[PDB]
Amino acid sequence: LKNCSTKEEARLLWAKVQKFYQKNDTLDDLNSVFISQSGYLLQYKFEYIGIPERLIYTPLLLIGFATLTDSLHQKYGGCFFGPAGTGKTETVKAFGQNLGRVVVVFNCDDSFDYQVLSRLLVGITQIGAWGCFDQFNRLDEKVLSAVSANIQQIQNGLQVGKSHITLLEEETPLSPHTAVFITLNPGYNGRSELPENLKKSFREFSMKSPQSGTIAEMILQIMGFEDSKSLASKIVHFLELLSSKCSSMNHYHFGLRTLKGVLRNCSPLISEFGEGEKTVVESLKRVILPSLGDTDELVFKDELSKIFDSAGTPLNSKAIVQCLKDAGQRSGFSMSEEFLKKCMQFYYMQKTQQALILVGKAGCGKTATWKTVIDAMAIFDGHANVVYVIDTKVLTKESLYGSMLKATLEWRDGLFTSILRRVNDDITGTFKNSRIWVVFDSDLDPEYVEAMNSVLDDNKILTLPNGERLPIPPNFRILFETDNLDHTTPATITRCGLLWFS
């Protein structure tokens, strides 16, 4: 608002921003505060929400809020399609939290029947809560047709305003406050679409993902702002120029995921140096450098020194070097400068992440590397190291993760979950005083890492088909030792530390 020319752009901007007003003459306390945006009004409900997670405010988030309030102004059901990973339900839940509402999410087709869905619809139609159909396209045609019929009855009762509606051949009152939202995953013939009966009652939105300069500036504002705009511009230009000159490799991922990782790695490093550009340079050299090849390390250095030159000499250059040399001597290894460099690199990388990926040719020395670093840590820190090595693709997912039996519910833990149980519940042994290294030494694929995706996410939780979440402690770190990433997603790569043995 400060950078506007006159009052015209200021009022244009202010129309889009959510305004929270209060009624002084209400005497109807629960209805005092209302929310105005672009001319439309919305009554605040005083529903307890606790401490929910807050999304980063971005222009596209406010555009999604504007589409929801625009559809609700005319009592129309809200729905938006787009590629997965753009935060459709997170946007809807954040929209509900902003008005003090708890959006009840309905997970569908995950062996999800239709009886309980109709029971939830009648209950949400009585309470007046807001329901969101997460990923509505993945449904069976008979269940999708019957549920779409029920949604049609609800929306028609809202548009007309009938107090009582016939649902499930049951007469039931309809509170006017209910609203339904439909998120749609991307189709396979194109983008997925709604059934024909629902097209004349919903408003479809094209929901995607944002660019990078603005989000970069915002995160930099969080960490310490000094020169937020210039640093964000320089980082984006540097990543573009890296993608420009570096060779086209499969595992190269310079997208927004990569820069969010670089900024999350910059956050604890500011505590070491300060809220300057030097911290950004060091984070980039900690994350990006180990993933680049010999041919591309000099490209990185050149472009780095080109766009911005910051510092010259790093910290922790000698005690760890000594412990490493001792470890290599105990193993009888020759402490080549490349081996030393990679050991130190790996040592620094593992400090701020739990999922490590080490890639190279067969015989590169990667296993010697990580074991030597582990022994060096055991000397320097005085903590123990417990190591488990699992050649995971010999095992099935069911033998690794759990499963269900024929009819008995009894849960087979599976190897990786059973060891994680032992790492947490034990409370006998020095696992809290140990580093725990679980090595998944094999070629990795989408299916297995998908079954454990929430561990790579900021959740740092192992989610199980059994419905339980296992929080991983800081002691627990994971190494995917392999030789290729061909069938690995960027989504996973950007959550892990990648080390390319060139």
Partner: protein
Amino acid sequence: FVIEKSLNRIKKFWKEAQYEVIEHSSGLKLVREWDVLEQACKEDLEELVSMKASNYYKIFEQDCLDLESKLTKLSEIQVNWVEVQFYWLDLYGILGENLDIQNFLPLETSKFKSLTSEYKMITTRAFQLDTTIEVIHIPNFDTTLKLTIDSLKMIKSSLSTFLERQRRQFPRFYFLGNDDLLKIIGSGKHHDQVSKFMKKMFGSIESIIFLEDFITGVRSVEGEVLNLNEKIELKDSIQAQEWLNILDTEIKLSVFTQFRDCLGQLKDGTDIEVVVSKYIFQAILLSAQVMWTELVEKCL
């Protein structure tokens, strides 16, 4: 011809019909593995029907007609008996055990026990005949089972309208389901077991805090404790729906109370750091939003 060779094996099979019987907790004995005998019955019926297309059976028929007339009624009693078995075993785990649920519904259980006695009579008498085919000679068995499943169906229909009306009183119960609501109604006296379901029927909060006399407040899934303004009284002659509805309105009024209190403090030139340690997150968020838009309106 082969007609005799088949009737012989049929009769041989049917003079060896035995039922696996095993007795559950209470006195009655349940029958296991229905499908074998029923499938044999149906198979033999289709064979007896097909015996009508032969040519060497005209004089050889009457015996097979008696056999058919026997097996048809056997299947008739088969169907009704398995249905009675299943429905009684389902209503038993709901009514035959708890005292509170039958105190709420005295009539239906009063009928349930009267049905269980007769069913015990029939089953014991039927098992002790030691030949599954001879059961059809036991008097009043088809009509018995017919009226028994009719009575069970009536009980089960009754058993659901009371729950639906309970859902109509408190619409959050729609999220719970039949099983959980049954435990809430039976365990309303103890009062602590309801707390496990509170995350399901609310979504925000986790557990309810007690002071052994009243409800001081509830805590969320994150761990933040909420203190109520008005404490909820508890007595002996109370239902779960009553104190649950009072709790439902009270938490909304307490949220508004801390919100206007927060806004009043923030209007009175206070620090955000002192307020955060005292008021909930949602109140300080809304009060901050109101004051922010209020100061920016004149700043515009």
